[PDB]
From a paper:
The PDE4 enzymes are distinguished from other PDE families by the presence of a pair of upstream regulatory domains known as “upstream conserved regions” (i.e., UCR1 and [name]). PDE4 enzyme activity is regulated by the opening and closing of [name] across the catalytic site, while UCR1 is required for assembly of dimeric forms of the PDE4 enzymes. The absolute amino acid sequence conservation of the PDE4 catalytic site, to which classic enzyme inhibitors bind, across the four PDE4 subtypes has made it difficult to develop subtype-selective inhibitors. However, a single amino acid difference in [name], a phenylalanine in [name] and a tyrosine in PDE4A, B, and C, has allowed the design of [name] subtype-selective allosteric inhibitors.
[name] allosteric inhibitors bind in the catalytic site and complete a hydrophobic surface that allows closure of the amphipathic [name] regulatory helix in which hydrophobic residues are oriented towards the catalytic site. Closure of [name] inhibits the access of cAMP to the catalytic site and consequently enzymatic activity. PDE4 allosteric inhibitors share a common pharmacophore that allows the compound to engage [name]. A central aromatic core is clamped between a pair of hydrophobic active site residues and donates an electron pair to a hydrogen bond formed with an invariant, active site glutamine. The central core is decorated with a pair of projecting, aromatic arms denoted as Ar1 and Ar2. The key phenylalanine selectivity residue projects from [name] into the active site where it makes an edge-to-edge or edge-on π–π interaction with the Ar1 aromatic ring and a face-to-face π stacking interaction with the aromatic Ar2 ring. By contrast, subtype-selective [name] allosteric inhibitors are designed to accommodate the phenylalanine while clashing with [name] containing a tyrosine (i.e., for the PDE4A, B, and C subtypes) as the tyrosine protrudes more deeply into the active site. X-ray crystallography shows that the binding pose of [name] to [name] in the allosteric site highly resembles that of [name] to [name].
Numbering used by the authors: 254 to 459, 463 to 577, 593 to 606
Write the structure that this text describes.
Amino acid sequence: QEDVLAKELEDVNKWGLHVFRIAELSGNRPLTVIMHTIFQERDLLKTFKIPVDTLITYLMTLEDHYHADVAYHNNIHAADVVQSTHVLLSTPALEAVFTDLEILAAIFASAIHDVDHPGVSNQFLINTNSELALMYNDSSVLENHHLAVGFKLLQEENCDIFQNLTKKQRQSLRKMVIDIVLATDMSKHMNLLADLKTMVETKKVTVLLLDNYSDRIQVLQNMVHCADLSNPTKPLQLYRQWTDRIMEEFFRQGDRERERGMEISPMCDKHNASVEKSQVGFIDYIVHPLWETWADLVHPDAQDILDTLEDNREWYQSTIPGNQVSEFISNTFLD
Ligand SMILES: CCc1cc(Cc2ccc(CC(N)=O)cc2)nc(-c2cccc(Cl)c2)n1
Ligand SMILES: [Cl-]
Ligand SMILES: [Mg+2]
Ligand SMILES: [Zn+2]
Ligand SMILES: [Zn+2]
């Protein structure tokens, strides 16, 4: 077990890590094992004086607060986004750009960004007058909740991984993490992208030059959003598993809607689904525009990511056997 797990974890710096195999091999602890590997590799325990027992205790706690029964928004997704961010952070164009604290912020934000996800959308929560939507005034409901939980868990026994940061570091990290996780609200996508394009238009290189907090945080926001929307850029055997999981989750929401006598939301009706066509639409309207812009920012570092993305689009287009794609996109990715 241990040797096989270690062998898989050798790919932690690679796009296309076998994250589902890691989940199986670790006894459903992919987030804990991947985070621990990354913190060791980046020397973050030493830099920030994080006790190893504290790190593991926090990670296990965090991982426990992802719902294993939610098909997509679970601990495997969190582990995937962490690992993807870890790879993006090492892209040559960004070499030496970010401080260790910024790195820690991006990785921690990735780890917590979907914690305690119930497997239904912000719009479902709002439309049902849910407790969470009442608590958060309909505004980035889940994302505010993920932050609140991810930070609160630091307060459990032997969980405060930031205990040896300075006051200023802790404040800065908290501000960056909030900014990053709030940017994972899918409704902010079009604004984030528009703003990234504008950044790319005026970029300075020596390797990217980022002079101010605003530019740095913008890049980290987009980096983690790209990681969150990275599934179609992965090896096809991985991508297809992510598709199958998100559709299962969506169809479960639709089943809840049906039981409540609600109109079934776009993409959530197992009786009227077009999985392949819907992925093509996702790539054409959302994922390709985003990744083409990231690739411009880090040119030429992300070329292989784009090539894969285009191959995968073709595969889905080729296996096709409306209002829905269009309605889903409008309701999901616009403010
Ligand atoms: C490849 C797995 C995957 C991931 C995502 C990303 C995503 C994550 C979360 C949400 C919000 C929500 N409803 O929970 C919406 C989209 N979207 C999709 C998808 C699936 C069908 C159609 C479209 Cl346009 C997109 N497919
Ligand atoms: Cl795998
Ligand atoms: Mg989310
Ligand atoms: Zn708890
Ligand atoms: Zn996510």
